[PDB]
Amino acid sequence: MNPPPPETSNPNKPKRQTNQLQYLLRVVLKTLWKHQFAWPFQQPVDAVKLNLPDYYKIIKTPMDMGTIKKRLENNYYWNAQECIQDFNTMFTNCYIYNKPGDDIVLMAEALEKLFLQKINELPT
Ligand SMILES: COCCNC(=O)CN1CCN(CCn2c(CCc3ccc(OCCCN(C)C)cc3)nc3cc(-c4c(C)noc4C)ccc32)CC1
Numbered sequence: 001m002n003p004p005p006p007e008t009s010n011p012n013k014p015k016r017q018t019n020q021l022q023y024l025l026r027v028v029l030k031t032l033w034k035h036q037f038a039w040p041f042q043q044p045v046d047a048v049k050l051n052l053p054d055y056y057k058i059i060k061t062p063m064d065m066g067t068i069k070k071r072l073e074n075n076y077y078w079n080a081q082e083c084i085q086d087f088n089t090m091f092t093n094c095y096i097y098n099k100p101g102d103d104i105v106l107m108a109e110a111l112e113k114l115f116l117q118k119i120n121e122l123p124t
Contacts, residue, residue, distance in 0.1 A: 003056060005044045006063060008070040013078065019123050020080035025072040028118040033065060035114065037107035041065045041090060058097050063089040080122070087115055 032038055043066040047055040056062070063086050070076075077083045094108040 001048055002044065002046055003062070006067045008067060008076055009074050010076060013076070015075040016078060017075065018080065021072065021075075021077055021083065023121075023123055024077075024080060024083050025069075027121075028115065029065065029069055029072060031118055032111055032115060033069065035111060037110055038065065040104060040107065041111065045093075052097075055097060059093045061089055061093070063087075063093060065090065084119065087112075091115075 033042065041064055044062055044064045045052070045055060045059070047053065065087075068083060068086050068090070071086070072083065091108050091112045094104060098105045
């Protein structure tokens with residue numbers, strides 16, 4: 001079955017808002033979220049609904065944009081790099097589990113290229 005989703009809150013961690021984290025939520029995440037290809041990435045991979053019995057043997061660090069969105073909304077991230085790392089993990093998991101040329105891989109590739117375009121405009 002599925003593991004519990006990644007934590008989206010950490011009560012022991014202090015919180016702050018930064019210009020880069022605001023930009024990651026309001027521009028980066030929002031832009032990817034509305035993309036034609038976003039739906040498969042808007043929530044944790046559900047291995048029982050999608051019938052993927054080996055998914056969590058192969059992918060031990062799941063990540064998805066629904067989790068990233070809640071993390072941003074909950075001020076879970078202290079450093080903007082934490083959020084960028086989660087996006088990268090999401091994309092890399094997709095490339096590891098699936099085969100090159102699969103529909104989902106070409107969708108991740110389009111989302112990643114757009115992610116990189118938006119991250120390039122991150123404010124100082
Ligand atoms: C270039 O390409 C052209 C454009 N693409 C297309 O036109 C092709 N299509 C796009 C839409 N896709 C949605 C399908 N999809 C979803 C949608 C959410 C969902 C829907 C139904 C469901 O359960 C009901 C039962 C459903 N059962 C019968 C399938 C549970 C979840 N989440 C996915 C995660 C994964 C994935 C992730 C991420 N990492 O590894 C894997 C595995 C893969 C595919 C996924 C299909 C292909």
